[PDB]
Amino acid sequence: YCEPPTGVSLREGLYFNPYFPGQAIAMAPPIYNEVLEFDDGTPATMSQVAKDVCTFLRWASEPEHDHRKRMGLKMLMMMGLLLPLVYAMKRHKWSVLKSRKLAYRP
Amino acid sequence: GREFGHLTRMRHVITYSLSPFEQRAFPHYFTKGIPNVLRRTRACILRVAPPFVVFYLVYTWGTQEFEKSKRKNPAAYEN
Amino acid sequence: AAPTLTARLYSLLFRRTSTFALTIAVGALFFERAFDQGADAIYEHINQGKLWKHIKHKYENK
């Protein structure tokens, strides 16, 4: 958050924010130092509380993160060794036909 | 009605072949894979690229020009 | 001309067509036995002290 520049008009209920498409939003600053108390024994700085909040929020928006990246790993190891088999059985079959000579005698 | 009995007519020709169990299936793969690509890419690297090459220019021109007249409007917004 | 493993294997269990189909069955029993551990150990070692099982020891059985 930053104070508003010079020569810019603003609404009475509006507060300056540079991250907004309108460059101003009704968000009265709700987050700053030592508004809370972390029960775990942590010196509560604004940055740390904001970081914990963001890490909470994304998880709430999509909880399947942790159960995804594990099947996405037990898929590669299993596949990555069966598929090099099929190739070999292939080669056998197509290896009948790459060995023929073809002469002509009228 | 066009199975393996009745098709074209040919005469006086001959062909030979082995089995698969009396041969190995990797005759110098490493030392013959590369030269084929070396000889063939040259021929058609020239036949797929130049048509595609004139899109990079127009895309970059338009992108950078629009970026100018969006991020640097206050240059010609004269007071 | 010493024979390889392949000749004795084909003499043992491959030229029956009543044996061959079976030992395919066999690998999955072995694979099932040896694969959960092989993947779980590596995944858990990649990121340690970061999932609840590494933090539950604060609050478990009082």
């Binding site: 991250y19 460059q23 890490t55 993160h65 | 991020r71 | 990121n47």
Partner: peptide, 24 residues
């Protein structure tokens, strides 16, 4: 007809391909 401020990037602790979530 104005500008916008695109946020930077940070080395987030869960940003990898094979990473996890800090559950504390």
């Amino acid at each position: 007809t104005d500008l916008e401020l695109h946020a930077p990037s940070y080395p987030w602790s869960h940003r990898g391909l094979l990473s996890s979530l800090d559950h504390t």
